[PDB]
Each structure stands twice: as C-alpha cells, then as structure tokens.
Amino acid sequence: MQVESLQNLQVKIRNDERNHSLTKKYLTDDIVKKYQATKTSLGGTLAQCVNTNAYNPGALLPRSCDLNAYETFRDFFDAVIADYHKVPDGKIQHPKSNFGDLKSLSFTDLNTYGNLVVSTRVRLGRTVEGFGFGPTLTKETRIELENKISTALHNLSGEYEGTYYPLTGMSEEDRIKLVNDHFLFRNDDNVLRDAGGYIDWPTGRGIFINKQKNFLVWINEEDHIRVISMQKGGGLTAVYKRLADAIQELSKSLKFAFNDRLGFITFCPSNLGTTLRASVHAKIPMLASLPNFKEICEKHGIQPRGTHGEHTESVGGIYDLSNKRRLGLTELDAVTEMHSGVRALLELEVMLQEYNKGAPEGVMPVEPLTYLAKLLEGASIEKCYTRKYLTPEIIKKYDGKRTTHGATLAHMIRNGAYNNRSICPRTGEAECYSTFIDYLDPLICDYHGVKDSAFKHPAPTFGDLSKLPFGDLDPTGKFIVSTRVRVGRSVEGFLFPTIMSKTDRIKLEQVISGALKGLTGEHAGTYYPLTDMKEEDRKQLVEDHFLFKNDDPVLRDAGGYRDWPVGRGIFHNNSKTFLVWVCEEDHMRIISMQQGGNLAAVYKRLIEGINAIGKSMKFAHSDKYGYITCCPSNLGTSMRASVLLKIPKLSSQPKKLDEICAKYMLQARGGTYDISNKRRLGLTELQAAHEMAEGVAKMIEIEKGL
C-alpha cells in the first residue's frame, strides 16, 4: 500500500482543525523523526498506520499495518492505547484469556427486566500469526489466510455446521439477500478504505454462517477473523457460551497473536485485549433522555450507541449497550461487566417508566426518590443542605407526591445526587415551596441563617432611586475595576428551567423577549436568541464574556440544559451595561454593570430595568420567602451586588479581610477580589446593596493605611 510520507500525513493531520484524533495528539515531531525510516518485520510503516487519520478527521484512532506495528512503533501506540483504554499510569497489561467455567456459568436472561431487549450479541476478533493486515498483505497471502480460516471453520463441531460464502464469485442476488439479513459486510467504510482494508477487493474475503444462523464469521473484513454469536431476546448465557466454545475449538486449528501487554492483537487498537464486545439492543427511551445518560452508562461500565436508521420513523429509544472495557480484564470480567451494567440500566428504565407514569409530556422524567437518595449518600451530611434535610420522615411523606404541574422531591435533589459536592437543591416550580415545605423550609432557615417568622416577607424595597444611601465608592481612580448588581426572577405560571417542557420554553421566551425588545432609553438593546443567532453575534458575546453554555454538570443534572438551546437567549443594551440572561437557571437573571465603582448608577439602572420588565409579566413572589427562584439560595431579594476590587495591600493580610467580610456579611473570591453581599433573604434590596457598599468602602480606606 503506497501512501504519502509520514511527515506529510502529520502536517495534514495537524493543519486539519476538524481533526481531534488521538493520532493527532501523539504523532509529534519526535515520533515522526524517530520512525520515518522504520519498517516492521512485515514491511509496514507508521505512515500506513496513520494514513486514514489524514483523510478522515472524524476518526479517533490509527490503524496498524500489521500485528508487529504495536511493538515497532511503540512510543506511538502505547500512548494512544493507554489514553483510549484509560490505563492508570500507562501500565498497559492484560491477563490470560479466560471465558470462565462454561459448564456452571449462568447469567440471568436480560429480558427479565422489563422485557426491553430486542436481541443479544457477542463479538470477538483474532489475528492469525504470520500474516499482515491490509497494508502489508499481498493478494495471495490474504487468500492463503482466507483458505486457512475457512478450512478451520469447515472442521468445526456440530452446532457450528453451516456454509462458507466467499465474496469472490458471489451472485449479486445472494449479495443483496445476505446484507438484508445483516450477514454481509461491504466495502463502504472510508476509514477502513484509507487504512488499506479494501485492497484487492473482493478477494481473500468471505462469511461463514451456521445452519441455525446464530453464529456468524467474517474473514478479512477488518481483522483476519471476526466471530459473532447472536439471537433475538436477552439470552446472554447461550450467546456467550456458543461464542466461547467456537473460539476455543478454533484456537486449536489456528495460531492467534497474543501478548501479555496488549492481549489479542487486532487491526484497530480499540479492539485489543479481550477484543470482546458483548451487547444488547434494548428499548430504553426514558433513560436515554436523561441529561447525563452517557455518564450513567459509563458509571455502570456500559457504552451506549444509538441505532438511528435501523427502525421506522416513530420507533425511537432503542440503544446498543455494550461493555465499555476491552483491555486489562478477562473475557469473563468483560461479559460480566456488560451483564451487570445492562441489568442495572434496564432496571432503571423500568423504575423510570413506573415513577413517571402519567407525568406531563415534555417534563423531565426522574428516577425514584429512593434511588436518588442512595446516590445522595455520597454527599456530606454536614455541608450538603440537600441531604441534611432529606430525613426518612420527609421521604416517607413526599415520595409519590407531585405538585399540581408535575414537580417532585426527586426532581429537586437530582443535581446533588449526581454531583455530591453540590450543596443545594434545584426546585421545579414556585409551588414546590408550599407543597414540599417540610423539606424546603428548614433547609432555607439553615442556609440563610433565619427562622420561621409570623410576618410577611416585606414588599420589594428598592429605595428612593434619586436619593440613594450610596454613590461612587471609588471616585479617585482605581481600587474598583467594575461594579455589578443582579437579581434572579421567576415568571408566574411557568415551570422552572429545570423541568419545564420545550413548548413551555418557547412560550416563556416569547413573553420575555417581547418585553426585552420593547425596552427603551438606557435599557434599549438587542435580544439574541441562542437558536437563531447570527454568527458574528456568537463570537462577540463570548469575547464579552456574556454567553452561557450547557457545561455546568450541576445545572445539567437538574435538567437545565434539556432541549438545548430552545428558549434560551441573551439581551444587552447597546452600552453593554445592562444584561439579561433568559432561561438559564432561573427564568431571568437581570444584570446591571459598568467599569468603575459607581454603585448608585449601576443599582439605579438595574431597578429601573426590573420594573420595566415587570410591566409585561408577574414575578413569582412569596409571603414566606420573597422573590421565588429555582435554587433556594437565591430567595428573598434574589440580589447580588458585587465589585471587582484591587486590594493587593490587605489581601496580604488574609484574615482581617475575612474579618472585614464576616463583619459586613460579604463574600470574597479571587490582589484582585470579587466582593459581594452574602445575604439574600431577611433584608431589603436597598440594604443588600448598602451592606456591600459599606463593607467595600471600608476595605478601601483601610487600603491606604497600609
């Protein structure tokens, strides 16, 4: 196989910004310099191995010119292998082949769990010693290899009796039939093509099927031998044993390449070790819809792949689920991983269907409260409010309960259940605060340092906007880089961004954007919806650090990124001193900011903005808690006033700062610090802004008495 120089391929792979392969990652100048004249014992080059990555940027891995490539080009392949197979300290190793004691081995039938499994499949691959791969085979040695393997297959035991079908000399009639029954491979994969997999097509190639059509072998498709056991249903035990018995019989007729580092050698590094892919096609629509579906699978040792194109238009939710591991475990460990993981995932799908039967459509489905409570046990009972107030009395009382519009207690602890360092819940709608009050009320009291009071949360008290108790905290020049004040707001009559439906989002965005588009004067600006953004706008918003992304796992697992990015948007006035985030965590985050330290103008602009938005919609507000938000941490005023502060001076005193902070109830984060009021609930908006203003103005006069 003639390819370009290794050096040319490297340049091609690197200059290709669509390419994010491991080949790209590890094919360094040093690797090229080292291996550019090197041949394997079969004549292969590293260029032949990485060729396909030059022309197919979506491909993650190299291939190999022959089985000796892994040893000959070891600095390249060990790095690629350790990386892809997640090998702890690059200590690549693999145990002896062991399918287990087949006579006493038993797995439960996977359809026990909801009858969701359409079919079950286990696949192996082997390299036969003494032969190259696509780039180093000749026409004749590939045929000799084919002859060697079909001869082995023909001699197989009774259950395996069947017919060998060479590709060469096959009628176009059987070709069509055999691919229909999904028995035939074709020369239609361009990654395989550019890795030399179709040279001398179709010679040296064929398939073997047994009489029962539950045993399939492919010769020289990619590997020398690919062996597949398969049937309808979830009978993994029979599928697995039929595969294991065949390969152990074949291993007496064929010498397969194995070493104690990589296990069984294959053409693609992804199939090293056991080479074993044990899988089901299962119907798991609800599980698949979960925000962290991929993570849930990986946590159970399972790799999911969708089956789009394999069904009719209205049939969805069918996934291929397989063991994620190939290398560094036995075949028994691998099929066990698949079985245990798939069993669990299928049990979760049944629990999901059961727990969300009759829930509103488009509303985030959720795992049973008791399931999530177990996950929540990882969280600290000392720090994590979510877990602290989730007593057995609370579980007993609220399990099975929904708000009028479909929110559950399960919903609101989900973010902490999957992110055990998250300390607060995320509610589903304003009614949560009355419906789950026995949970939420003590949590709120704790977090905000308050108690149950007989009296109404005071009305919004913004103050007199023309006669404020603060002005410019830094007239001089620079201690304050910038000042910012924001509130969160919920709109009455809508579910929160956590669990709300896509249709709700659209309708909410219509209400809000309409109001934003009509803002006049200092507040006049442009609404940028995330679904229909013009390219130029996207980049400017990032450079401005205005854009929000679907990248926080806590908000993700709360449901906050469902149906992305429908209904989400950014508004800012022309000056970029007034900003609104639409439907990120709360329905709105309303923000006023500017360079310098004029808090009064920032706060004034904010309040006027809130009011002008409020003309077109009602804000969710509570007698108990003031303004209602998704997270209980931002109740009350839901207001955060902050400054970007230069205090290199007293930052070098790291504990009269914290004492200036505790004393004036401020929070600090980093001689440049983001300083803000800590309180949200139990005080007026005017006071919140004024607490930050005094705490900061005092830092500042301390900051020259150095």
Swiss-Prot record:
Gene3D superfamilies assigned to the protein according to its UniProt record, in alphabetical order: ATP:guanido phosphotransferase, N-terminal domain, Glutamine synthetase/guanido kinase, catalytic domain
Bilayer-crossing residues are none
What are the annotated disulfide bridges?
none
**Active site annotated at which positions?**
C268, C631
Q: Where are the Approximate repeats?
A: 1-363, 364-670
Q: Where is the Phosphagen kinase C-terminal domain?
A: 116-352, 479-706
Which residues are ATP-binding? 119-123, 182, 226, 277-281, 305-310, 482-486, 545, 589, 640-644
Family matches, as CDD domains: arginine_kinase_like
Q: Which PROSITE patterns match?
A: PHOSPHAGEN_KINASE, PHOSPHAGEN_KINASE_C, PHOSPHAGEN_KINASE_N
Alphabetically list the UniProt keywords: ATP-binding, Flavoprotein, Kinase, Magnesium, Metal-binding, Nucleotide-binding, Oxidoreductase, Repeat, Transferase
Which Pfam family would be a valid example here? ATP-gua_Ptrans
**Listed GO biological process terms:** phosphocreatine biosynthetic process
Which reactions are catalysed by this chain?
taurocyamine + ATP = N-phosphotaurocyamine + ADP + H(+)
Known cofactor(s): Mg(2+)
Gene Ontology cellular component list = extracellular space
GO molecular function per UniProt: ATP binding; creatine kinase activity; metal ion binding; oxidoreductase activity; taurocyamine kinase activity
The keyword GTP-binding is annotated on this UniProt entry: no
Domain Phosphagen kinase N-terminal as annotated: residue spans: 5-86, 368-449
SUPFAM superfamilies registered for this protein in UniProt: Glutamine synthetase/guanido kinase (SSF55931), Guanido kinase N-terminal domain (SSF48034)
| Superkingdom field | Eukaryota
Q: Does the keyword Magnesium apply?
A: yes
Its biological purpose: This family of enzymes reversibly catalyzes the transfer of phosphate between ATP and various phosphogens (e.g. creatine phosphate).
Name the protein family.
Answer: Belongs to the ATP:guanido phosphotransferase family.
Q: What is this protein called?
A: Taurocyamine kinase
What is the organism field in this record?
Schistosoma mansoni
Q: What broad taxonomic lineage does this protein's source fall under? A: Eukaryota, Metazoa, Spiralia, Lophotrochozoa, Platyhelminthes
